[PDB]
Amino acid sequence: RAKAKSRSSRAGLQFPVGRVHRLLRKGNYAERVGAGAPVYLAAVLEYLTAEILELAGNAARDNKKTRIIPRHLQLAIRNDEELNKLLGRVTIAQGGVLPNIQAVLLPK
Amino acid sequence: KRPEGMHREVYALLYSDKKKVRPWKWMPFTNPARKDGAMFFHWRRAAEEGKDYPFARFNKTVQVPVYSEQEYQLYLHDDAWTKAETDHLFDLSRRFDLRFVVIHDRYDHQQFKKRSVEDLKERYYHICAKLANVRAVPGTDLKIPVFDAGHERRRKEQLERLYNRTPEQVAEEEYLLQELRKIEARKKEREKRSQDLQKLITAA
Amino acid sequence: WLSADFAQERRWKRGVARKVVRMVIRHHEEQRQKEERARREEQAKLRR
Amino acid sequence: KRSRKESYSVYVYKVLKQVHPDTGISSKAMGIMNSFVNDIFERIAGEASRLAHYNKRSTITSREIQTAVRLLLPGELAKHAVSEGTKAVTKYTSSK
Amino acid sequence: MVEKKTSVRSQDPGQRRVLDRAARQRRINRQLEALENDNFQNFQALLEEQNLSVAEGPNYLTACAGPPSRPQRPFCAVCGFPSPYTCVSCGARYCTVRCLGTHQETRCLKWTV
Amino acid sequence: DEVGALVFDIGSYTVRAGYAGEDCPKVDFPTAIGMVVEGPTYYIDTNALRVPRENMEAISPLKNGMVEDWDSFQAILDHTYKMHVKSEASLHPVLMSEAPWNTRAKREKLTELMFEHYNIPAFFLCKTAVLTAFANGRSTGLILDSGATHTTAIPVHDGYVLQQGIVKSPLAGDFITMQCRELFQEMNIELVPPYMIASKEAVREGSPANWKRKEKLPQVTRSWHNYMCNCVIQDFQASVLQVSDSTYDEQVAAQMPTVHYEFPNGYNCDFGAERLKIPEGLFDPSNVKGLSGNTMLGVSHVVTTSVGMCDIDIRPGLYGSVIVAGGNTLIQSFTDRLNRELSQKTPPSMRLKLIANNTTVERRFSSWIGGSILASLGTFQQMWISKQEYEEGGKQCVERKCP
Amino acid sequence: DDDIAALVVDNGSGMCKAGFAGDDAPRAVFPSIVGRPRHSYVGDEAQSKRGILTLKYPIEHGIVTNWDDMEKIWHHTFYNELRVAPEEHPVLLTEAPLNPKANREKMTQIMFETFNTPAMYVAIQAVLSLYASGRTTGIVMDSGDGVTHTVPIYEGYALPHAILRLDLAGRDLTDYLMKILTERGYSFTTTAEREIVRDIKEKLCYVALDFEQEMATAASSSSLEKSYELPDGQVITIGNERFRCPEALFQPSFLGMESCGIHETTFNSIMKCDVDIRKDLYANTVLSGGTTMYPGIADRMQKEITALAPSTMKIKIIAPPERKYSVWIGGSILASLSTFQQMWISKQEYDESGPSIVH
Ligand SMILES: Nc1ncnc2c1ncn2[C@@H]1O[C@H](COP(=O)(O)OP(=O)(O)OP(=O)(O)O)[C@@H](O)[C@H]1O
Ligand SMILES: Nc1ncnc2c1ncn2[C@@H]1O[C@H](COP(=O)(O)OP(=O)(O)OP(=O)(O)O)[C@@H](O)[C@H]1O
């Protein structure tokens, strides 16, 4: 038959719409999924992934490292005002913290 | 009233959350990479009819030295090889781009005595070496490790015994293989363990 | 490169031919759903 | 006799390699990159689930998905996510 | 067939977060040293023996003229012609809408890392 | 790169012809064409060739895959040029297949014949093995070809044939045809070729046919009758035969299912173990009554001997790139059986891999497909033997140019 | 909206069959000839000026003089239809039984450079007809005035290794009937008569399977020698050329050409196919082209093949009643198709890659 086109490709996404919708079809998140839910969900998922990978890589470069470590994730998700909010109640393994030293605990 | 008029899903998402005149032509073209002037025909646009062929750069001739008659006579002379016996090797070298697994098979065994791959390789290499040696002085890198034929004759051979081993040496060898561990464990787990126990019982 | 290109082209054109056969099969059974649609419109006329 | 386990590593490297051509990503950082995707997927799908159920609906839809993205992501985060998805649904229903 | 770039969606500037002020200086500095740079597209030894040469007397470091009286002129940097405009983000100058287009696509914000 | 040029693959059983860059040949027709010495007159399209004729020869111009009857060969190429291609030969370069064991005299004679009789602009004579390698996407591999006349293993290494590695066996489609003759005779089957039947009626399994013979039949000669019967036999080979997945076992073959078959006159019956016994002779010729002798090599042994005659350094490549071709390889379980026996007899130090082509066009016309792809590359447009090469160097140019 | 605006053309050396597509009969029909001075008319004008014009067929049993004659035929085709070309011109066009690479490059170069068609597609006539036949596969015989095909198309593709051809459908049978007459004084002496010798077929080709009937009738013939109206007003009765002429579609040697007929041609064609897939070529046996409008030849394509084929498979003849036009219909069904547009060739890829595009 026709050369089969995927659902990540037709829409123009990298995250698997087939796999996303798939977790949804047998995920009981609902009872009869439509034909746009996985597309929107994957699009936004991967959008946030890109949003963060950006800040993580930029901080990494600030550290003169070419590989993103979990530190390049703690520093980032705490450096950006809205990523921190979204991931406020999330601990990133082996990420560390940001060097926020209280002003009153300094040399005087 | 609802404007809509577009796709259901996209519509809901958007509102619910408010002359070519370039003639190709059948065209003659000559390949500048060829010396015979052969004219071929091609499917080119109108706007490039007359440009040089773009596949003539993929013509990097493998380099092979070309000894002359005088040069050969002086230095390339070899009691076991004649000029008729040696020019053929270089012709095959060039026509097969200096590869010696395919030069061998097409060797002329009718006028020529039978040679292995290693001897042909060593012969051509001594020829290349002495050709550059005629130069030598012009910084001709007299450091060439020309292909070892002796060790390599062996190295070809002592793979062949391991190539055709129906069982045992392919099958039974597993045993000796395991023994490599055993022979490397139980002896020291023997004579050394004994010596350690002798000292332990000596202090005890 | 060109052998993979040839294989892709042959595979692609065989699939294209098969889905044209399938598409025309769908068009023909739609050209019978046409008669069914006329009959259903007549039943709707009875209901009207 | 294999025990294969799925993950998002293949598409987080497509997106990363595309949005940072020179930058790699460590295996441990890709684990975080995977967990993040699964977490947000859970959040958005759960909020769309609740959205559909509140309106007495048996189907989670992309309209509910957009409203759940409006509820979940903060203001800008939302705007960008909603725009990206919205434009991805009109590029998909136009048979491109 | 498809528009064939939504897959890579490189910039997607909903979160653009401009680079400015000191970053501009960094770029300026970088460009300067690149114009001062060498074949590859000993300098550490030069800097070392120059930091041996630091003193207040007449020497290498104290032989610098300084700022000019005649003020700096604008130039376009895409075609090099006089440039009435400045790029709002990075501060580099240009002279047309076309030049701003090229600059936004290749040199604005992209080489600030 | 791709120019209006003609690809010819002249097999012992059929000839394929077409243009460069096609997925499939423009035409394929029997090489064993028909002739009457009228000069002589020839018939090639199967519609004029299957006519029962006042005189007949069924001449078959090629001997052991090589040209011997140059007149009938010329007639074949003439008819091909103006019946299926329908183009002037002086316009299109010609790429043509040949057997790897073809002699220099034949190459030179074909070169001068091509340039003098067909006035062609350029020429390229290439061996079936290299073409088959190009068709299967590899520069190195063992090319196994089980054709009509002989089954041959030819090593290609870096695009060149290893003459010392060629191994050939007469166990081939014609040998299968002989086995079918013998089996039909031992089953007392009334084989009737299709041309003879005016009409027929249905009959029970194993019962003789109920048919009427045509009244207008002339006194056809023996050779053409043999050809027609052999065509029915080769249809039977497609229809009924199947290789045993492993070494032939009379008990297992007795347990294996039958295949029902019918001959043109209407005689019909089930075939059992025999349809598996015939192809076994291709893989182990020892159990072949009438052909006793240990000098014969079967398909798998042809392969292993061919690779074993090469340098041990290139045997890993050859075993890792076994490319299988020829019509006989379409027999059911042929490739599975070959893979099994080669997995048993390939040394453990080396990987075994068979390229996974399966289509009729692939298996048979790999040589033509190789011509099609080869004639479609810029790097190849400098390899042509041009008409100038011939006018300057003479008939011998084909020896100085491409191997 | 290129399916809705689709145009279809087929030259038809006996009669052209073209038009704005989507309906079941051609809009444009003309005898597909080019007239020149003896010492440029193409539409029912050369057929009258035959006595003062040198007439040439742009058809050569599957080959054409692609530049002059074909461009004139296309140019005329538009005048035999809505003349919509400057507003819309998406096309699919006349094509050979076997000449894709050599035809299509020049053909599409002319059509994109002269006729500037926004969309093009090309395919084998039998593959067009298959989509009137409404099934995946068949022997489609694809007859006409110029060729006698036996192309065994499978799953929408014309497998060229099994495609065979024959040369007895048009001109040959017309001349054969012309020289069967002159035996009885019917006076078909010149081309003006030849052009209605090919219309005697409208009535005379026999009603049933006839290879024995032609023997049985000849001894005591009455009330079967149907008359035909000559242009001279004569109504002469027709003799055993009630059977002589069409017989040669199945006994070419009876016309004097050394071959076996369409039944054997098709049987050999399907015999060169795969052993499994030919099960469907038996299950889908199909007829097309004007020469298949005879009644009895359908019974021939049943019985003459049943005599050769095995008893297990049956002969499912599904010849459409309007088989004169099943190419036209099928091509139309292919061209006027809502979701087919993805398979047009268009002026951007033509410009980026040339007439040597994959088509
Ligand atoms: N479908 C089939 N199934 C089984 N065997 C087949 C089939 N078709 C052909 N054969 C066998 O293959 C033989 C022909 O093989 P093929 O067409 O590959 O030879 P060829 O190209 O003439 O060979 P060569 O190039 O070696 O001279 C026929 O004699 C018949 O024995
Ligand atoms: N009305 C008719 N009744 C019966 N047979 C006919 C009729 N019209 C034409 N024929 C036969 O069919 C032939 C023409 O058929 P058709 O019009 O389908 O061919 P065409 O399209 O002109 O040919 P080609 O496809 O070779 O170019 C005529 O030569 C005659 O043999």
PDB file of N, CA and C in Angstrom, chain C residues 17 21, chain G residues 97-98 123-142 149-164 266 269-270 273 277-278 280-288 327:
ATOM      1  N   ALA C  17       1.479   1.668  -6.343  1.00  0.00           N
ATOM      2  CA  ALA C  17       0.541   0.950  -7.200  1.00  0.00           C
ATOM      3  C   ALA C  17      -0.504   0.215  -6.373  1.00  0.00           C
ATOM      4  N   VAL C  21      -4.549   0.833  -6.290  1.00  0.00           N
ATOM      5  CA  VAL C  21      -5.549  -0.225  -6.435  1.00  0.00           C
ATOM      6  C   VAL C  21      -6.552  -0.151  -5.289  1.00  0.00           C
TER       7      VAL C  21
ATOM      8  N   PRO G  97       2.597   1.014 -25.195  1.00  0.00           N
ATOM      9  CA  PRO G  97       2.580  -0.267 -24.468  1.00  0.00           C
ATOM     10  C   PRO G  97       3.894  -0.555 -23.761  1.00  0.00           C
ATOM     11  N   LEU G  98       5.031  -0.274 -24.417  1.00  0.00           N
ATOM     12  CA  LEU G  98       6.355  -0.403 -23.801  1.00  0.00           C
ATOM     13  C   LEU G  98       7.267   0.667 -24.412  1.00  0.00           C
ATOM     14  N   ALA G 123       0.855   6.784 -17.591  1.00  0.00           N
ATOM     15  CA  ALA G 123       0.829   5.372 -17.234  1.00  0.00           C
ATOM     16  C   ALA G 123       0.422   4.555 -18.453  1.00  0.00           C
ATOM     17  N   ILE G 124       0.619   3.239 -18.344  1.00  0.00           N
ATOM     18  CA  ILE G 124       0.279   2.320 -19.425  1.00  0.00           C
ATOM     19  C   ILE G 124      -1.235   2.262 -19.589  1.00  0.00           C
ATOM     20  N   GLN G 125      -1.690   2.214 -20.845  1.00  0.00           N
ATOM     21  CA  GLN G 125      -3.123   2.221 -21.125  1.00  0.00           C
ATOM     22  C   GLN G 125      -3.858   1.105 -20.390  1.00  0.00           C
ATOM     23  N   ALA G 126      -3.245  -0.077 -20.290  1.00  0.00           N
ATOM     24  CA  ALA G 126      -3.899  -1.185 -19.599  1.00  0.00           C
ATOM     25  C   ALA G 126      -4.099  -0.872 -18.123  1.00  0.00           C
ATOM     26  N   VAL G 127      -3.132  -0.197 -17.501  1.00  0.00           N
ATOM     27  CA  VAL G 127      -3.281   0.181 -16.098  1.00  0.00           C
ATOM     28  C   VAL G 127      -4.407   1.193 -15.940  1.00  0.00           C
ATOM     29  N   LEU G 128      -4.570   2.085 -16.919  1.00  0.00           N
ATOM     30  CA  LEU G 128      -5.743   2.952 -16.933  1.00  0.00           C
ATOM     31  C   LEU G 128      -7.021   2.123 -16.968  1.00  0.00           C
ATOM     32  N   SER G 129      -7.100   1.182 -17.911  1.00  0.00           N
ATOM     33  CA  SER G 129      -8.323   0.399 -18.093  1.00  0.00           C
ATOM     34  C   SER G 129      -8.662  -0.415 -16.847  1.00  0.00           C
ATOM     35  N   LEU G 130      -7.637  -0.893 -16.137  1.00  0.00           N
ATOM     36  CA  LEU G 130      -7.874  -1.692 -14.942  1.00  0.00           C
ATOM     37  C   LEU G 130      -8.795  -0.976 -13.966  1.00  0.00           C
ATOM     38  N   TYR G 131      -8.688   0.349 -13.886  1.00  0.00           N
ATOM     39  CA  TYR G 131      -9.473   1.129 -12.942  1.00  0.00           C
ATOM     40  C   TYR G 131     -10.888   1.394 -13.436  1.00  0.00           C
ATOM     41  N   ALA G 132     -11.204   1.015 -14.676  1.00  0.00           N
ATOM     42  CA  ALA G 132     -12.594   0.795 -15.052  1.00  0.00           C
ATOM     43  C   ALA G 132     -13.016  -0.627 -14.711  1.00  0.00           C
ATOM     44  N   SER G 133     -12.086  -1.583 -14.828  1.00  0.00           N
ATOM     45  CA  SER G 133     -12.395  -2.966 -14.482  1.00  0.00           C
ATOM     46  C   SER G 133     -12.651  -3.148 -12.989  1.00  0.00           C
ATOM     47  N   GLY G 134     -12.225  -2.199 -12.155  1.00  0.00           N
ATOM     48  CA  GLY G 134     -12.571  -2.218 -10.745  1.00  0.00           C
ATOM     49  C   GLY G 134     -12.004  -3.374  -9.948  1.00  0.00           C
ATOM     50  N   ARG G 135     -10.759  -3.771 -10.211  1.00  0.00           N
ATOM     51  CA  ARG G 135     -10.160  -4.898  -9.513  1.00  0.00           C
ATOM     52  C   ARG G 135      -8.640  -4.768  -9.580  1.00  0.00           C
ATOM     53  N   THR G 136      -7.952  -5.593  -8.780  1.00  0.00           N
ATOM     54  CA  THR G 136      -6.522  -5.397  -8.561  1.00  0.00           C
ATOM     55  C   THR G 136      -5.677  -5.848  -9.750  1.00  0.00           C
ATOM     56  N   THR G 137      -6.191  -6.754 -10.580  1.00  0.00           N
ATOM     57  CA  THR G 137      -5.334  -7.565 -11.436  1.00  0.00           C
ATOM     58  C   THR G 137      -6.083  -7.936 -12.711  1.00  0.00           C
ATOM     59  N   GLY G 138      -5.332  -8.276 -13.759  1.00  0.00           N
ATOM     60  CA  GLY G 138      -5.950  -8.846 -14.942  1.00  0.00           C
ATOM     61  C   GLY G 138      -5.006  -8.952 -16.122  1.00  0.00           C
ATOM     62  N   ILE G 139      -5.505  -9.648 -17.149  1.00  0.00           N
ATOM     63  CA  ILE G 139      -4.766  -9.968 -18.373  1.00  0.00           C
ATOM     64  C   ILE G 139      -4.876  -8.845 -19.393  1.00  0.00           C
ATOM     65  N   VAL G 140      -5.325  -7.669 -18.952  1.00  0.00           N
ATOM     66  CA  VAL G 140      -6.034  -6.719 -19.802  1.00  0.00           C
ATOM     67  C   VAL G 140      -5.427  -6.725 -21.200  1.00  0.00           C
ATOM     68  N   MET G 141      -6.270  -7.007 -22.201  1.00  0.00           N
ATOM     69  CA  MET G 141      -5.789  -7.241 -23.558  1.00  0.00           C
ATOM     70  C   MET G 141      -5.544  -5.937 -24.298  1.00  0.00           C
ATOM     71  N   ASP G 142      -6.185  -4.849 -23.869  1.00  0.00           N
ATOM     72  CA  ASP G 142      -5.820  -3.495 -24.283  1.00  0.00           C
ATOM     73  C   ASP G 142      -5.646  -3.399 -25.798  1.00  0.00           C
ATOM     74  N   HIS G 149      -2.273  -6.039 -27.333  1.00  0.00           N
ATOM     75  CA  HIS G 149      -1.567  -6.282 -26.087  1.00  0.00           C
ATOM     76  C   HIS G 149      -2.096  -7.542 -25.402  1.00  0.00           C
ATOM     77  N   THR G 150      -1.261  -8.114 -24.529  1.00  0.00           N
ATOM     78  CA  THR G 150      -1.714  -9.109 -23.562  1.00  0.00           C
ATOM     79  C   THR G 150      -1.065  -8.866 -22.201  1.00  0.00           C
ATOM     80  N   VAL G 151      -0.933  -7.598 -21.824  1.00  0.00           N
ATOM     81  CA  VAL G 151      -0.221  -7.169 -20.621  1.00  0.00           C
ATOM     82  C   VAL G 151      -0.897  -7.722 -19.369  1.00  0.00           C
ATOM     83  N   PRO G 152      -0.237  -8.629 -18.612  1.00  0.00           N
ATOM     84  CA  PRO G 152      -0.819  -9.172 -17.362  1.00  0.00           C
ATOM     85  C   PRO G 152      -0.527  -8.320 -16.125  1.00  0.00           C
ATOM     86  N   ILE G 153      -1.309  -7.253 -15.966  1.00  0.00           N
ATOM     87  CA  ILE G 153      -1.103  -6.328 -14.855  1.00  0.00           C
ATOM     88  C   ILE G 153      -1.524  -6.983 -13.546  1.00  0.00           C
ATOM     89  N   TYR G 154      -0.724  -6.761 -12.503  1.00  0.00           N
ATOM     90  CA  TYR G 154      -0.972  -7.312 -11.176  1.00  0.00           C
ATOM     91  C   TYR G 154      -0.801  -6.221 -10.127  1.00  0.00           C
ATOM     92  N   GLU G 155      -1.777  -6.118  -9.222  1.00  0.00           N
ATOM     93  CA  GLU G 155      -1.738  -5.158  -8.119  1.00  0.00           C
ATOM     94  C   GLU G 155      -1.411  -3.754  -8.623  1.00  0.00           C
ATOM     95  N   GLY G 156      -1.958  -3.406  -9.788  1.00  0.00           N
ATOM     96  CA  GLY G 156      -1.824  -2.070 -10.332  1.00  0.00           C
ATOM     97  C   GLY G 156      -0.554  -1.794 -11.107  1.00  0.00           C
ATOM     98  N   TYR G 157       0.259  -2.810 -11.382  1.00  0.00           N
ATOM     99  CA  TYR G 157       1.559  -2.636 -12.020  1.00  0.00           C
ATOM    100  C   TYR G 157       1.668  -3.538 -13.240  1.00  0.00           C
ATOM    101  N   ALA G 158       2.245  -2.998 -14.316  1.00  0.00           N
ATOM    102  CA  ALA G 158       2.372  -3.713 -15.588  1.00  0.00           C
ATOM    103  C   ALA G 158       3.742  -4.378 -15.631  1.00  0.00           C
ATOM    104  N   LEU G 159       3.802  -5.608 -15.119  1.00  0.00           N
ATOM    105  CA  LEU G 159       5.032  -6.388 -15.054  1.00  0.00           C
ATOM    106  C   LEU G 159       5.613  -6.574 -16.452  1.00  0.00           C
ATOM    107  N   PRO G 160       6.730  -5.919 -16.789  1.00  0.00           N
ATOM    108  CA  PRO G 160       7.210  -5.979 -18.180  1.00  0.00           C
ATOM    109  C   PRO G 160       7.855  -7.302 -18.563  1.00  0.00           C
ATOM    110  N   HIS G 161       8.244  -8.141 -17.602  1.00  0.00           N
ATOM    111  CA  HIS G 161       8.868  -9.410 -17.968  1.00  0.00           C
ATOM    112  C   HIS G 161       7.843 -10.406 -18.493  1.00  0.00           C
ATOM    113  N   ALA G 162       6.557 -10.185 -18.208  1.00  0.00           N
ATOM    114  CA  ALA G 162       5.493 -11.038 -18.729  1.00  0.00           C
ATOM    115  C   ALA G 162       4.658 -10.366 -19.809  1.00  0.00           C
ATOM    116  N   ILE G 163       4.811  -9.055 -20.006  1.00  0.00           N
ATOM    117  CA  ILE G 163       4.073  -8.360 -21.055  1.00  0.00           C
ATOM    118  C   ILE G 163       4.472  -8.926 -22.411  1.00  0.00           C
ATOM    119  N   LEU G 164       3.488  -9.399 -23.166  1.00  0.00           N
ATOM    120  CA  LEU G 164       3.656  -9.782 -24.560  1.00  0.00           C
ATOM    121  C   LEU G 164       2.765  -8.902 -25.432  1.00  0.00           C
ATOM    122  N   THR G 266      -2.427 -14.461 -24.889  1.00  0.00           N
ATOM    123  CA  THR G 266      -2.721 -14.199 -23.482  1.00  0.00           C
ATOM    124  C   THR G 266      -2.335 -15.375 -22.595  1.00  0.00           C
ATOM    125  N   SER G 269       1.279 -15.164 -22.164  1.00  0.00           N
ATOM    126  CA  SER G 269       1.578 -14.023 -21.305  1.00  0.00           C
ATOM    127  C   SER G 269       1.407 -14.386 -19.834  1.00  0.00           C
ATOM    128  N   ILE G 270       0.243 -14.933 -19.470  1.00  0.00           N
ATOM    129  CA  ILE G 270       0.020 -15.295 -18.070  1.00  0.00           C
ATOM    130  C   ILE G 270       0.914 -16.460 -17.669  1.00  0.00           C
ATOM    131  N   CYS G 273       4.081 -15.347 -16.139  1.00  0.00           N
ATOM    132  CA  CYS G 273       3.947 -14.738 -14.826  1.00  0.00           C
ATOM    133  C   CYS G 273       4.304 -15.736 -13.724  1.00  0.00           C
ATOM    134  N   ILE G 277       0.695 -16.059  -8.409  1.00  0.00           N
ATOM    135  CA  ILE G 277      -0.076 -14.861  -8.712  1.00  0.00           C
ATOM    136  C   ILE G 277      -0.916 -15.042  -9.974  1.00  0.00           C
ATOM    137  N   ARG G 278      -0.512 -15.936 -10.885  1.00  0.00           N
ATOM    138  CA  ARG G 278      -1.343 -16.155 -12.061  1.00  0.00           C
ATOM    139  C   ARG G 278      -2.706 -16.736 -11.697  1.00  0.00           C
ATOM    140  N   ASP G 280      -4.722 -15.308  -9.940  1.00  0.00           N
ATOM    141  CA  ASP G 280      -5.587 -14.149 -10.091  1.00  0.00           C
ATOM    142  C   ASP G 280      -5.737 -13.722 -11.545  1.00  0.00           C
ATOM    143  N   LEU G 281      -4.708 -13.928 -12.372  1.00  0.00           N
ATOM    144  CA  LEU G 281      -4.855 -13.629 -13.792  1.00  0.00           C
ATOM    145  C   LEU G 281      -5.911 -14.526 -14.428  1.00  0.00           C
ATOM    146  N   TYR G 282      -6.028 -15.771 -13.952  1.00  0.00           N
ATOM    147  CA  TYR G 282      -7.173 -16.594 -14.321  1.00  0.00           C
ATOM    148  C   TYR G 282      -8.462 -16.014 -13.751  1.00  0.00           C
ATOM    149  N   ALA G 283      -8.426 -15.560 -12.495  1.00  0.00           N
ATOM    150  CA  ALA G 283      -9.626 -15.057 -11.836  1.00  0.00           C
ATOM    151  C   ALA G 283     -10.025 -13.670 -12.324  1.00  0.00           C
ATOM    152  N   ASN G 284      -9.116 -12.939 -12.980  1.00  0.00           N
ATOM    153  CA  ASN G 284      -9.395 -11.620 -13.557  1.00  0.00           C
ATOM    154  C   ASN G 284      -8.884 -11.632 -14.996  1.00  0.00           C
ATOM    155  N   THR G 285      -9.739 -12.017 -15.941  1.00  0.00           N
ATOM    156  CA  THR G 285      -9.405 -11.943 -17.356  1.00  0.00           C
ATOM    157  C   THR G 285     -10.330 -10.938 -18.031  1.00  0.00           C
ATOM    158  N   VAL G 286      -9.729  -9.993 -18.754  1.00  0.00           N
ATOM    159  CA  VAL G 286     -10.330  -8.694 -19.041  1.00  0.00           C
ATOM    160  C   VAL G 286     -10.066  -8.329 -20.496  1.00  0.00           C
ATOM    161  N   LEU G 287     -10.999  -7.590 -21.098  1.00  0.00           N
ATOM    162  CA  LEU G 287     -10.904  -7.167 -22.488  1.00  0.00           C
ATOM    163  C   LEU G 287     -11.137  -5.664 -22.598  1.00  0.00           C
ATOM    164  N   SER G 288     -10.475  -5.046 -23.576  1.00  0.00           N
ATOM    165  CA  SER G 288     -10.557  -3.603 -23.761  1.00  0.00           C
ATOM    166  C   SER G 288     -10.198  -3.264 -25.201  1.00  0.00           C
ATOM    167  N   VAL G 327     -10.434   1.901 -21.374  1.00  0.00           N
ATOM    168  CA  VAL G 327      -9.257   2.724 -21.105  1.00  0.00           C
ATOM    169  C   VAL G 327      -9.704   4.118 -20.684  1.00  0.00           C
TER     170      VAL G 327
END
